[PDB]
Amino acid sequence: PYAKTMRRNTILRQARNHKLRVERAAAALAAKSD
Amino acid sequence: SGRLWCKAIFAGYKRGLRNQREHTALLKIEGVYARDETEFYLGKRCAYVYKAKNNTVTPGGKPNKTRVIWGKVTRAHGNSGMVRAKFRSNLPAKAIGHRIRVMLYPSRI
Amino acid sequence: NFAELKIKRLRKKFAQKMLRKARRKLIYEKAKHYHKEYRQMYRTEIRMARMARKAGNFYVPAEPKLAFVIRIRGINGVSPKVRKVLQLLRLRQIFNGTFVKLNKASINMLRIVEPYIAWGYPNLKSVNELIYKRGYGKINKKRIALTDNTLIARSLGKYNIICMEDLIHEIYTVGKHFKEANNFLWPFKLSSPRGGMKKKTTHFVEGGDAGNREDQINRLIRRMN
Amino acid sequence: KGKPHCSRNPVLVRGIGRYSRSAMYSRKALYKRKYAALATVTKPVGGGTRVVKLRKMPRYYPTEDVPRKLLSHGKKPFSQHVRKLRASITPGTILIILTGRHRGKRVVFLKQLSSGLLLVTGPLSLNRVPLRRTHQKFVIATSTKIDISGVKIPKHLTDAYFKKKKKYEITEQRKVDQKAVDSQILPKIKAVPQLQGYLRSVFALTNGVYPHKLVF
Amino acid sequence: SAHLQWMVVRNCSSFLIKRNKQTYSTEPNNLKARNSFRYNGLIHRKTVGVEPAADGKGVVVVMKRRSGQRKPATSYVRTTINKNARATLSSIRHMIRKNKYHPDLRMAAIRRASAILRSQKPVM
Amino acid sequence: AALRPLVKPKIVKKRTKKFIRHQSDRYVKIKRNWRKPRGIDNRVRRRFKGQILMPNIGYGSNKKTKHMLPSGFRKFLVHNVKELEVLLMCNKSYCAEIAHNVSSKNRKAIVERAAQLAIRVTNPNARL
Amino acid sequence: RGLR
Amino acid sequence: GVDILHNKDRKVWRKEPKSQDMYLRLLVKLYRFLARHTNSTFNQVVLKRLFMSRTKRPPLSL
RNA sequence: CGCGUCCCCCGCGAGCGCACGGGGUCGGCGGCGAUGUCGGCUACCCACCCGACCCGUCUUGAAACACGGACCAAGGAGUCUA
RNA sequence: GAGUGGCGCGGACGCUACGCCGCGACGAGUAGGAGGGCCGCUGCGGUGAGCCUUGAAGCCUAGGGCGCGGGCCCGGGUGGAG
């Protein structure tokens, strides 16, 4: 049963990390405009 | 009008050397000569069109002498754009090196 | 006048129902604690190594508790001693798999049937899918599929192995009831390696498939499972 | 007395809610919404009065009946099936009907109907194709798309509208509906250069032309 | 007793008819007409028979009386039911349910009578 | 307007060809009736490739559709009118068949009675 | 009795 | 290919009496029912003995 | 996720409905057909592909340059007694 | 599990118990052994109010089938007495 909770936590974690990575890439593009 | 199918050759059955499995055909579709280009044709409908002495019915037409064994391109065969097909009746060895029509209309594009 | 036995038969059903919910919550929280263990287990091996490396020393990690032994040779033209050791491992068919916990009375058997087995130290994910996908229990000496936890709870409940997760924990972290938990598992009916064997006849060291493959059993478990 | 609400935890994955059942018990207000513990009708007759029976016993039993079959779950009827499109079949794309009596004809797509089938209109002026349904599988979607978003397709031309009732005679409703929709599309296809002629032409495979090589 | 004289009859009765991997029993009071303990129309104390009439139309119901079972001549009371189908199938249900008279043969007798009233109905 | 069975399942047969006897082709003395080759060097006995197949138990038909006709019924062979009422309650599963040596006047009774009892006959038009 |  | 010796994978006990007498066979039908249903291990041993040959159930003297 | 009470640090609430839930259904349709077509796995003849040596027998080993067999019908061999 | 104590007349199938149903595993085979034949043959005791000159046995068959198989059932032709 705990599998659903583990999977949900992993998916949320992964989405958060992807958003962070996108934000870092945007910052790199801003630096690469400066 | 124009042609709505691609030129394949019944290039023998799925076979080892000293055993052949007549249930699966090996199709050589003209143009595709690698496993990269055989991916479009997977799941497509393939027809062996022949004609006999006696007239038989035609769906949406008057009785021709032309007949079919309908099939399906199941998966890729080997490394060089050869493809496996599996017909509702096992293709006759009369048809070896003769034209079968790999259709377009289990279309995914 | 049936007003009693109407509700009394419901009172039974509710007590049966609320009891499963308590058993479900235990299974849920045992599953949450083993996650916490496997984390701490996986983390501390990297930790002990880093503090060994900082000091300039070496952390020689714990010689593994647990092996997964796969039979690679067939049933024809086989030595009598090799026949016996392969059928004490319950490897009575080609590509049958069993977990075998390491010691002296394990490895001197596994080295004697080296040419007929491909074995190594399985992962956590390897122990998961082998127990989840290929998991069958010897219940009444019959190979019955582990589809509800009440088949593991009925055979292994007397050792407090009461769900699929407890079994995985018992195998991977070789528990005090490993024998009873591992002998419960029917020798795993694995398919042919999807990708191909390198060479069945020779040892893995000499570009073959046979014998001890320490980390590398997991690549062929995923090739076969 | 209480009117229904939309499900609060959004669908993160199919069969998983975004919120846990502690984050959900929170949202559903269960912390403050606690709770403690046919057949016969009498008709008159002008004699006595009769007690007649709704769904009475049968007059015939056959020599053997089949048993009640077991209960499978995920097997919905076709009226309840989920209806998928290809992402290439966007409302406004120009298709190539492969298999019909209109085989090869370049045809303007309109909308996915409420029975899986594509409502399609190869202008009856150009293609000689009516308001007609087509199946997704028997139709190629091209990189040829007109700005169709702002044409008003009628509501009443639905799945049951095109269903074969029973020598077919065209109803004068079907002729008005062709002209009603053709008056909106056919000006916006002439807006694009050489497109009115492209729809007129039929699709054809020829020598040295391989469908995997033409990317469209 | 029933279970005794079954073990004599089960394989060697004159009514028992074996061919085509199938077994039947051509007894006066077997209904479903198959070689069985349940449906055997000689061997039980209580036996329900459903036959068509000695005239053309109707169903006769043969109830084997409890008393004289070593008396073959007086052992059966025959009642002909020449009514509508729905109330013929009812009467046979009421003879078996509401006399408790061998209630295992309640549905078999109603299915037989149904197939007799279907038989004596004219074909087009 | 023929008789329908209870269930009409897809009668799947593992093999439809006869298991003809080994060297029944070469000789007239040797019948097509199968005999197991028990010779010490027989190709057919010891399972050589491209040889005559032997009847194993593996070829056994599905127990549900075993003895089932193309119509979806089983045969029960009938000699007189008295042996039809046998089938009047196993009507939708088992069909009647009138035996070869039943006379022309006596089929006319069995065909006409099977019409009344709704029993199917495999050979109703056989003397006339 | 906790959920009464 | 599984290395199983099919030598001893048929158990050679009686699962009925070889006798065709119907008074003994009705006693088996009764103790078929009692042995499996009643958890008593008595009726199981009796059922087994109802099967056994003349020699295997010898005459117990008074 | 109450509190009616028992203490170590300061025994049954009612409903509804969706389903990755103990083995498939559709509440989807579509062409055709009375003198020439529809069905028929088998069976008749033919063709093609792959396979494929002639059986019985004694024998370590037989397709054998080992022996018996031109062909067909009928007969023909573990019996009865102690 | 029991006791004295504070309207609507209804419910499929089944169980030849030598029957029926369920679940796991397994399947080479000469010499050889055993089991099961609703395999076949010819006579006997029973039985099937069996079949038969309105056509038995036999025989033929590019007819329809059944059975894993031994074989068997039908249709047509021939035949004349079981």
CA-CA distance, E51 to E99, in Å (whole number)? 20
Question: Comparing C-alpha atoms, which of E5, H38, H41, H10 is closest to residue H49?
Answer: H41
Question: Comparing C-alpha atoms, which of E52, E78, E81 is closest to residue E64?
Answer: E78
Q: Integer distance in angstroms from CA C224 to C1' J36?
A: 43
CA-CA distance, A8 to C15, in Å (whole number)? 31
- What is the secondary structure of chain C as a DSSP string? --HHHHHHHHHHHHHHHHHHHHHHHHHHHHHHHHHHHHHHHHHHHHHHHHHHHHHT----PPPPSEEEEEE-S-SSS--HHHHHHHHHTT--BTTEEEEEE-SHHHHHHHTTTGGGEEEE---SHHHHHHHHTS-EEESSSSEEE--STTTHHHHSGGGT--SHHHHHHHHHTT-TTHHHHHHHBPPEEPPP-TT--S-SSSBGGGTSSBEE-TTTHHHHHHHH-
By three-state DSSP, how is residue B77 classified?
Answer: strand
The partner residues of C107 in beta bridges, in order of sequence, read: none
DSSP D145: E
User: In Å, how far are D170, E33, E92, E113 from D63, measured between CA atoms?
Assistant: 51, 12, 16, 10
CA-CA distance, D71 to C17, in Å (whole number)? 23
Question: Which segments of B1-109 are extended strands (E)?
Answer: 5-15, 20-29, 46-51, 66-70, 73-77, 82-85, 99-103
Three-state SS string over E35-76 comes to CCCCCCCCCCCCCEEEEECCCCCCEEEEEECCCCCCCCCCCE
Q: Report the sign of the C-alpha dihedral through residues C59, C60, C63, C68, in that order.
A: positive
Q: Which residues contact C157 (CB under 8 A, 6 or more apart)?
A: none
Cβ-Cβ contacts under 8 Å, E22 against chain F: 74, 76, 94
CA-CA distance, B101 to B41, in Å (whole number)? 12
By three-state DSSP, how is residue F119 classified?
Answer: coil
Does F75 reach chain E within 8 Å, measured CB to CB?
A: yes
Which nucleotides on chain I have any atom < 7 A from a protein Cβ?
1-2, 4, 11-14, 19-32, 36-39, 41-43, 47-59, 62-64, 71-73
- What is the secondary structure of chain H as a DSSP string? -B---TTSSS--S-SS-S---HHHHHHHHHHHHHHHHS--SHHHHHHHHHHS-TTTS-----
Question: Comparing C-alpha atoms, which of B75, B56, B78, B74 is closest to residue B65?
Answer: B56
For chain A, how long is the longest CA-to-CA vector? 51
Q: Which residues contact D119 (CB under 8 A, 6 or more apart)?
A: D110, D111, D112, D113, D131, D133, D153, D157
Which residue minimizes Cα–C1' distance to J25? C142
Is residue E85 a contact partner of residue E91, using CB atoms and an 8 Å limit? no
Is residue D49 a contact partner of residue D42, using CB atoms and an 8 Å limit? yes
Q: Which residues contact D84 (CB under 8 A, 6 or more apart)?
A: D116, D136
Does H3 reach chain C within 8 Å, measured CB to CB?
A: yes
Is residue F118 a contact partner of residue F91, using CB atoms and an 8 Å limit? yes
Q: Which residues contact B38 (CB under 8 A, 6 or more apart)?
A: B29, B32, B76, B81, B82, B83
Is residue D121 a contact partner of residue D107, using CB atoms and an 8 Å limit? yes
User: In Å, how far are B94, B95, E86, E93 from D57, measured between CA atoms?
Assistant: 64, 63, 8, 11
- The tokens of E76 are what? 């059966």
- Minimum distance, in Å, between the CA of residue E86 and any CA atom of chain D: 4
CB contact under 8 A, A12 and D12: yes
Please name the residue that has the structure tokens 């045969």. Answer: F75
CA-CA distance, D131 to D141, in Å (whole number)? 18
- The tokens of E51 are what? 């036959």
Return the closest nucleotide (C1') to the Cα of F11: I41
- The tokens of C69 are what? 């032994």
CA-CA distance, C156 to C133, in Å (whole number)? 19
- CB-strand contact B18/I, under 7 Å: yes
CA-CA distance, E90 to E80, in Å (whole number)? 14
- The tokens of E33 are what? 């007409």
Cβ-Cβ contacts under 8 Å, E23 against chain F: none
- Minimum distance, in Å, between the CA of residue D37 and any CA atom of chain G: 8
Is residue D155 a contact partner of residue D113, using CB atoms and an 8 Å limit? no
DSSP F86: G
Cβ-Cβ contacts under 8 Å, E4 against chain H: 22, 26
Residues 178-197 of D with CB under 7 A from strand I: none
CA angle at D121 for the pair D118 and D122, rounded to the nearest 5°: 125
- The tokens of D62 are what? 């056959």
By three-state DSSP, how is residue D211 classified?
Answer: coil
Rounded-to-5 percentages of helix, strand, coil across chain F: 15, 10, 75
The partner residues of C157 in beta bridges, in order of sequence, read: none
Three-state SS string over D30-41 comes to CCCCCCCCCCEE
The total number of residues shown for chain B amounts to 109
Cβ-Cβ contacts under 8 Å, D212 against chain B: 31-32, 37, 39-41
What long-range pairs does D189-196 form, CB within 8 A, spacing at least 24? D189/D108, D189/D123, D189/D126, D189/D146, D191/D146, D191/D147, D192/D146, D195/D94, D195/D144, D195/D146, D196/D126
CA-CA distance, E67 to F76, in Å (whole number)? 39
CB contact under 8 A, D13 and A7: yes
Question: Do B and G count as touching (3 or more CB pairs closer than 8 A)?
Answer: no
Number of H-type helices and E-type strands within chain D: 4, 9
Region at C123 (left for phi over 0; alpha for psi -120 to 50; beta for the rest): beta
CA-CA distance, C64 to E16, in Å (whole number)? 72
Method: cryo-EM
CA-CA distance, B26 to B12, in Å (whole number)? 6
Name residue B41's amino acid. Y
CA-CA distance, C162 to C150, in Å (whole number)? 7
> Out of F7, F88, F92, whose CB is closest to D62?
F92
Picking from D53, D55, D56, D59 by the largest number of E CB atoms within 10 A of its own CB, the best residue to mutate is D59
Please name the residue that has the structure tokens 């984050």. Answer: D23
Number of H-type helices and E-type strands within chain B: 0, 7
Q: Integer distance in angstroms from CA F99 to C1' J79?
A: 19
CB contact under 8 A, B37 and D212: yes
Q: Integer distance in angstroms from CA G4 to C1' I5?
A: 16
CA-CA distance, F4 to E124, in Å (whole number)? 18
Is residue E60 a contact partner of residue E81, using CB atoms and an 8 Å limit? yes
Return the closest nucleotide (C1') to the Cα of D4: I16
What is the CB neighbour count within 10 angstroms for residue E31? 23
Cβ-Cβ contacts under 8 Å, F67 against chain E: 20-21
DSSP F23: T
What are phi and psi for residue H60, nearest 5 degrees? -70, 115
Three-state SS string over E79-119 comes to EEECCCHHHHHHHHHHHHHCCCCCHHHHHHHHHHHHHHHHH
H helix or E strand, kind and range, residue F75? strand F74-78
User: In Å, how far are B37, B63, B74, B78, D206 from B30, measured between CA atoms?
Assistant: 11, 31, 17, 15, 12
H helix or E strand, kind and range, residue E15? none
CA-CA distance, C167 to C189, in Å (whole number)? 18
Is residue C89 a contact partner of residue C137, using CB atoms and an 8 Å limit? no
User: In Å, how far are B77, C26, D65, E40 from E109, measured between CA atoms?
Assistant: 64, 56, 15, 13
CA-CA distance, B64 to H59, in Å (whole number)? 89
CB contact under 8 A, E114 and D56: no
CA-CA distance, B109 to C11, in Å (whole number)? 61
Q: Integer distance in angstroms from CA E31 to C1' J53?
A: 38
* Closest Cα in chain B to D212: B40
Q: Which of residues 101-120 of F touch E (CB under 8 A)?
A: 115-118
CA angle at C216 for the pair C212 and C220, rounded to the nearest 5°: 105
Region at E100 (left for phi over 0; alpha for psi -120 to 50; beta for the rest): left
Q: Using N-to-C axis directions, what is the helix angle for E106-119 and E85-97, rounded to 10°?
A: 160
User: In Å, how far are D103, D121, D131, D144, D159 from D126, measured between CA atoms?
Assistant: 15, 10, 13, 16, 24
- Minimum distance, in Å, between the CA of residue D64 and any CA atom of chain E: 8
Query: Do the bridges between strand E22-25 and strand C136-138 make them parallel or antiparallel, or are there none, so unpaired?
Result: unpaired
Question: Comparing C-alpha atoms, which of C164, C165, A6 is closest to residue D20?
Answer: A6
By three-state DSSP, how is residue B32 classified?
Answer: coil
